Amino acid sequence: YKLICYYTSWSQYREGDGSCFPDAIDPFLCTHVIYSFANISNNEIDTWEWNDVTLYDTLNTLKNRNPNLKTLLSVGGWNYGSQRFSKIASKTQSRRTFIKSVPPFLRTHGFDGLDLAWLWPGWRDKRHLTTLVKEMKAEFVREAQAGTEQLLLSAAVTAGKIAIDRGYDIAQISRHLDFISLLTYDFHGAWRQTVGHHSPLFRGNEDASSRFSNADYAVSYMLRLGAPANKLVMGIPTFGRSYTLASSKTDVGAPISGPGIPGRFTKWKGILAYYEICDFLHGATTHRFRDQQVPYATKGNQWVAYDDQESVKNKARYLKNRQLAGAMVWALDLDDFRGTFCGQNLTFPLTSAIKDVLARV
Numbered sequence: 001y002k003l004i005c006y007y008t009s010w011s012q013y014r015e016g017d018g019s020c021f022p023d024a025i026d027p028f029l030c031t032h033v034i035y036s037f038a039n040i041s042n043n044e045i046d047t048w049e050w051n052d053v054t055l056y057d058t059l060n061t062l063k064n065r066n067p068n069l070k071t072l073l074s075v076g077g078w079n080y081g082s083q084r085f086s087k088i089a090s091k092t093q094s095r096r097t098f099i100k101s102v103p104p105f106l107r108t109h110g111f112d113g114l115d116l117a118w119l120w121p122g123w124r125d126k127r128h129l130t131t132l133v134k135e136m137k138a139e140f141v142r143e144a145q146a147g148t149e150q151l152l153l154s155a156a157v158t159a160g161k162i163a164i165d166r167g168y169d170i171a172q173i174s175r176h177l178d179f180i181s182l183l184t185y186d187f188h189g190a191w192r193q194t195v196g197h198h199s200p201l202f203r204g205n206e207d208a209s210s211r212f213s214n215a216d217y218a219v220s221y222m223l224r225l226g227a228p229a230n231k232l233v234m235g236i237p238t239f240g241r242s243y244t245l246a247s248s249k250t251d252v253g254a255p256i257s258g259p260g261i262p263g264r265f266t267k268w269k270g271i272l273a274y275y276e277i278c279d280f281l282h283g284a285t286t287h288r289f290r291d292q293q294v295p296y297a298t299k300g301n302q303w304v305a306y307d308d309q310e311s312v313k314n315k316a317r318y319l320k321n322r323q324l325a326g327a328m329v330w331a332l333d334l335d336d337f338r339g340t341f342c343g344q345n346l347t348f349p350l351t352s353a354i355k356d357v358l359a360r361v
């Protein structure tokens with residue numbers, strides 16, 4: 001079973017205890033740690049932060065403690081224009097420059113592979129993504145003849161049916177990819193004017209406005225789309241989402257004035273790290289969507305959907321039962337990485353619960 005964990009670049013800038021560098025990652029936690037994100041500049045893979053070269057180096061030295069640890073670099077993300085990915089991929093010359101540029105850049109900085117994070121191809125892009133992947137792999141195949149062990153290639157895929165049909169030819173890319181991380185935690189559109197959970201595992205009975213909008217839909221659908229189970233990795237979120245409430249209504253359908261106030265360390269309207277969530281829980285009312293098997297919390301005018309040791313465990317049981325290749329965590333800097341907030345001393349409490357479960361019979 002793989003445990004694929006993301007680390008984010010911009011996490012180093014958060015104040016006081018929120019500051020995370022790759023130094024803090026326990027090297028026996030994950031099987032694969034993925035650095036996010038890399039830029040493309042001059043049609044060529046490239047660093048993003050001013051000091052990525054250093055943080056790459058600090059991450060790749062975690063390999064000294066655990067020589068088996070695999071690392072990847074992720075290209076794209078959202079700060080980065082789909083538009084701009086589209087331009088690179090849809091032309092045979094910009095696509096060629098970029099692909100050729102990737103192996104020596106990985107080798108130089110000590111990575112074992114590439115993660116493609118194009119969020120997200122439009123329908124005109126679908127056929128180019130397929131070509132990118134296909135030719136990117138052939139290049140990793142060509143490079144391996146040089147003696148070093150073959151570079152890994154993975155991709156991050158949205159878990160919403162619409163976005164899947166629109167941008168991906170799953171049958172085709174699964175052939176060349178070493179795994180796919182399914183982004184099963186963006187299932188509650190913020191544009192909706194009500195409460196709701198974003199990584200439910202099951203639809204629930206509550207009403208069924210969408211039956212497609214849950215992890216189990218996403219996984220069965222990829223499998224039916226011809227993604228083999230052994231190349232599929234289910235995404236588990238480590239953060240929560242928050243919404244300010246339009247009333248004292250707090251249950252299914254409860255109306256919303258908008259996103260929740262910024263977390264103290266992440267300072268982003270609508271999102272909270274698990275460590276800022278454990279602190280929010282003090283003085284909160286706690287509930288669990290029985291059917292969707294994930295929790296939520298509320299206090300003052302603030303309502304929060306999130307994952308916990310129990311829901312994270314339960315997802316890991318589900319993916320084993322389904323014989324998926326493993327789990328993906330978003331993300332190491334949003335787990336309680338210091339272990340100081342969440343009562344038990346335990347650091348990376350969310351990621352360790354998964355890890356503990358993956359090891360079970």
Ligand SMILES: *[C@@H]1O[C@H](CO)[C@@H](O)[C@H](O)[C@H]1NC(C)=O
Nearest residue numbers: 039040041042043047048049
């Ligand atoms: C990424 O590359 C683009 C295009 O070359 C460049 O203009 C942009 O500023 C780069 N972004 C960062 C953060 O380095």
